[PDB]
Amino acid sequence: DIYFRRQVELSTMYRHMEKHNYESAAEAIQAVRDNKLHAFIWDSAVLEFEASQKCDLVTTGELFFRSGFGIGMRKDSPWKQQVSLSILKSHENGFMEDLDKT
Amino acid sequence: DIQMTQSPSSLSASLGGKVTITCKASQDINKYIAWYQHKPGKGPRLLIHYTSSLQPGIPSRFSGSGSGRDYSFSISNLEPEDIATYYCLQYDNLYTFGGGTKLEIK
Amino acid sequence: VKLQESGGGLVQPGGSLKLSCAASTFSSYTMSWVRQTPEKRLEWVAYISNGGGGTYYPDTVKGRFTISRDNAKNTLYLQMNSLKEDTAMYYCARPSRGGSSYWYFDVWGAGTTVTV
Amino acid sequence: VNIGAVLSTRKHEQMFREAVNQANKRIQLQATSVTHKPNAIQMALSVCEDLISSQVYAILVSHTPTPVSYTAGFYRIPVLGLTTRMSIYSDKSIHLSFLRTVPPYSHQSSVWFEMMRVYNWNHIILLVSDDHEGRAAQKRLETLLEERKAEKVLQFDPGTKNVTALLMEARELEARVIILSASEDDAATVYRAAAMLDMTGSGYVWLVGEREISGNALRYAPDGIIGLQLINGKNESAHISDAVGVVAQAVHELLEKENITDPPRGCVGNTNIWKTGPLFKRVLMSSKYADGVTGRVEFNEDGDRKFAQYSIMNLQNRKLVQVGIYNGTHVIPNDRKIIWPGGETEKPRGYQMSTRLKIVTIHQEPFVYVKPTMSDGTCKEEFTVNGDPVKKVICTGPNDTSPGSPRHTVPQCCYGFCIDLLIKLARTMQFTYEVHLVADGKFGTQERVQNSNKKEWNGMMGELLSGQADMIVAPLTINNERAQYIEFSKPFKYQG
Amino acid sequence: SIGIAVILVGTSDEVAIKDAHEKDDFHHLSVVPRVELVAMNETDPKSIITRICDLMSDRKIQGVVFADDTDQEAIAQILDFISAQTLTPILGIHGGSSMIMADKDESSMFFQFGPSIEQQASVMLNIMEEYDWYIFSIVTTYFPGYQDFVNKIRSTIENSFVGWELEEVLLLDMSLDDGDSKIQNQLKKLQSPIILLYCTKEEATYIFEVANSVGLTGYGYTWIVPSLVAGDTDTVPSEFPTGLISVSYDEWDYGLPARVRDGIAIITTAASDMLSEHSFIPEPKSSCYNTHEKRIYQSNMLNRYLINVTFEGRDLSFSEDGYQMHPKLVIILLNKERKWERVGKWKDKSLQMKYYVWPRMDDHLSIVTLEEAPFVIVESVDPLSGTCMRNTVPCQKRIISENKTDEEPGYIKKCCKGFCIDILKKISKSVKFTYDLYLVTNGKHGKKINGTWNGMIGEVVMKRAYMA
């Protein structure tokens, strides 16, 4: 809702979005399979898992808003130099590849 | 509602004497006073307002003083067209009335 | 504006006599009227506001009396029931400065009698 | 010219008229009669028993001064200094102008802000009652913070009946500096509830405002309290003398100008706006003085002196000894041996590095699961496809178990991607941790609430902003709007 | 037997004022109220105080009404003094405004009768939100009510305004100023057209001397200020330009005798017996010198009850800062001969404007179109705002009706999208344009019958200043 509200060229699309929104991910996921909702917009890192277990739905390709989920901290906490290191270390020695393989 | 009781029973006076009748209500009235006079069979005539304010057409023969709930009203210099009977009114609650007295001449 | 009473009687002892007092502006003017004792006491009878509400009596004639008024014909309506020990005279009185409040009238009526 | 007066001290009225003969060296003067009573209403009646001769004069006198700032602000009657410490009386919305001499209760703002640079940097939780007396100080101290960091502030308007909850919450927060600006009965209330909570003891308590020394408060304070007090602020003779001095300098300066017309001498028949009111305000707002008996007094936009000298006190539990003085820039004392009950080592900074952190998460599969536990509290031990132990942690679930209206919190059980990464980070960085779920489940966004000009942050990120947690380990995207004041890390993954 | 003050105005008809209130029958509520008339025309504080508390000392007075001519400061704050000194309810005033600011803390008072300054700003947006025309300027001189005013028009101009441009303009204070110096630097930016600030009448006469000196008087501009600067009354100097439109609440308000009856009804309906949960007997004050600690328990129960009372279709209520909760509203008045002529009435949230276009505004064109396939799409309007965001075009469609009344160029301005409208929004910026966009009615677009043409070419051959 921030990405759509920010853009001006998509404003009419956002004006079409206000009358059908949901409150949680599972509500819309169950509502797509009940044919009340023909399409849904969310992250790729949830939909590619959902398209491998509940085996009736599909994604459709391209990406719009490329980013990554990050650790949210309070401003100027002293852990801001430690946790920015160890994450990179976990990306180096193959921990995250074990994590998403598991 | 509040009820009043005037007293006592008489306006016995000669030509030009002095009588005074008291407004006595059950509750504090804050000088809520009127005074009326009538013949038997004619109809009332107003005398007195808030500060014993007399009426145009009514002479200076009628005065009074008092406060709170007790008021005195004095009549003097009476010409015998005022063969009447004098009555006090309170309106704290909707209207209030007592007994009142009648005038005789000796 | 002047007040003239009508409907005078007590032809049934303990009956009901609808007396009235017409006026000739009385629509913004409240009403309350008076019977007279043999001791001549100007005792109150009933109470209406100018707008029909506020229907009350003093403690002499409570419990028996049916009350109304009509500001179109500029008339009052109340049936006399508990005057059956009195040879009373009734007049109507229109209190000055109007309203549903009350003030000091010089605007009284004419005076008619009610006899048993 | 004469000089109106409001009674306060009788012999001061004798010496002002004696001082008028002194002021006659600059354009001749006299003084008039004075009056003050216990009836405010009456004193508003008797303003033009004094204003009849107010065709070219100004007068404002200290002790509430409420019925006189409004009366002599009608006809634009110039109003001068006095002895007030409220804040409603420095406002371009309540009255026209009435110069000041003593700085207000909130106006001791910077003596604290400069104390940090005197010792060491600090972090401040600032306790403030809910009134303008404190909202003004909050705004001023935030204007001082917006120069070149503070935990939070609280609300306690009617705080005088078992208010330990507020202090119980400040005990949990990581802050050893307390700023307390309230009334003396509220000072005797916070001192109760902190002594019951042992914050008078091993904690710290910092003691702001001039309403903490006087009153039952000095009966109720430990050794080592620091209070402030202004230099000669109870020498009202020195005030009336410098008052007649700053008006004698202002009269000769104003009389030499043009369009010196005077207001009328009637007090019950005037209706116009006399144009020399602003000229009086102009000549008074630019009146810089050399020196008197009260120290050099100049004027700010609020007609205050701005150059007040403040006396720094300390309680050794036998007397409030003064240790140092203020002069815009603080003078550095030398007999300043600050105690604390404490002993003498616990005088500098001192921050408690917490090792138990609060974590907020949300229900998002396959990243974070949510499962109800077994019947005995401890949840189900399971195994992977490889027979490996699925490491779980007991997430404190929401009160809103079922989206309806019920509010019952239960121990649930949680597991997953972010849970495993939190396990590795906690084993790496020595973390004691608790995990409680989010209130509603709306991921955090910004909107304008409470039909005004306030924009608070809904959902999870508001619980990060309000101190309900200290880390967010969840699928939370990186945006321009969240990164305005929330620092991120290298973001786990890449997606769209 | 309740004590109600009167009105002291040095002019009006106290008979109509008496008669209006005395027909409201306050029975079925508790005791009946009363009135006592007096009059004064002087405007100093001391006469006001010794009359108000003289009448307080004589009568057991519950509340005070007041209005004299048109002086706002010479009443205001003085009333907040006597109200907080006496702990007694006091009605709102006419003869000055009861507005600009009840800024003191109403914890011992409260008096008011008027719309708020923000309800006026909200209707000032919905009025200029009838045709086009977003918020241009910022309040330049020092109102004391400035920071709330700008922080409310800012906080509503972004979360719910239909594509609005910037405000490159600020606030100064030319009271301490020597003259036309810093007001010269603000007359450059100040783009076109503008919005006038909140100032005084004399200083408006000043700032119009500076604006006439630079050239802002003619110049194709309009000026909205909501009445409180110059439109306090029917009196205006000739140094006011013919663009100086202005909204108030009043040309048939407080001064009316029915309004007096409404004011009597608000104080009198809030009976102590009506407060059935707290049947407390009010002990009114003795005199203006003491008895201020006896009303500590009574006035707080009274503070909760004045808000929404029910009346006889006239439900008037107050906020914590004393305003309505459905205030009486009027529209903007304009003329050119010393210049206020009435154009409207507003109640809840309606406007029902007398014209759908502003008179006094060649490069102004009418343009006629047609709804059809992928070129000009007509859709309906928003049910909360009326206008259109992406379309940004009126398309004032006429209705064909019964042959006794004219057509409807006040039918709701249906949105118009497509490919030609996006072309038109580029062609306007290419040279210089101005639209007057409307639809065809006979529906016979592009047809020639025996003798004549119909539809769009029918309005081409009739020379109606057109495009297609």
Numbering used by the authors:
A (entry chain A): 711 to 812
B (entry chain N): 1 to 106
C (entry chain M): 2 to 25, 28 to 87, 89 to 120
D (entry chain A): 27 to 52, 58 to 94, 103 to 187, 211 to 558
E (entry chain B): 34 to 394, 403 to 509
Sentences from the paper on this structure:
N-methyl-D-aspartate receptors (NMDARs) belong to the family of ionotropic glutamate receptors (iGluRs) that are involved in the majority of fast excitatory neurotransmission. NMDARs form heterotetrameric ion channels composed of the obligatory GluN1 subunits and GluN2 (A-D) and/or GluN3 (A-B) subunits. All of the subunits contain an amino-terminal domain (ATD), a ligand-binding domain (LBD), a transmembrane domain (TMD), and a carboxyl-terminal domain (CTD), which interact with each other in defined manners to mediate functions including channel gating, allosteric modulation, and cellular signaling. More recently, a number of studies on intact tetrameric NMDARs showed that the subunits are arranged as a dimer of GluN1-GluN2 heterodimers and that domains and subunits move in discrete patterns to control channel gating and allosteric modulation.
Toward this end, we purified the intact GluN1b-GluN2B NMDAR proteins in the presence of 1 mM glycine and 1 mM glutamate and complexed them with the purified Fab2 fragment. We subjected the GluN1b-GluN2B NMDAR-Fab2 complex, but not the GluN1b-GluN2B NMDAR-IgG2 complex, to cryo-EM since the former showed higher sample homogeneity, which resulted in electron micrographs with evenly dispersed particle distribution. Single-particle analysis resulted in three 3D classes that differed from each other mainly in their ATD conformations. The resolution of the 3D reconstructions ranged from 3.9 to 6.6 Å as estimated by Fourier shell correlation (FSC) curves, thus, the quality of the cryo-EM density maps was mostly sufficient to identify and trace secondary structural elements as well as the side chains of bulky residues. The cryo-EM structures unambiguously showed that Fab2 binds to the R1 lobe of the GluN2B ATD. One heterotetrameric GluN1b-GluN2B NMDAR channel is capable of binding two Fab2 fragments at the equivalent region of the two GluN2B subunits. The single-particle cryo-EM showed density for the ATD, the LBD, and the TMD of the GluN1b-GluN2B NMDARs along with the density for the Fv portion of the Fab2 fragment, which interacts only with the GluN2B ATD. The closed GluN2B ATD bi-lobe disallows sufficient reorientation of the GluN1b-GluN2B ATD interface to cause rolling of the GluN1b-GluN2B LBD heterodimers, thus, the channel gate is closed. Allosteric inhibitors such as zinc stabilize closed GluN2A and GluN2B ATD bi-lobes by binding at the inter-R1-R2 cleft and tethering residues from the R1 and R2 lobes. Thus, GluN2B ATD bi-lobe closure induced by Fab2 is mediated by a different mechanism, likely involving long-range interactions.
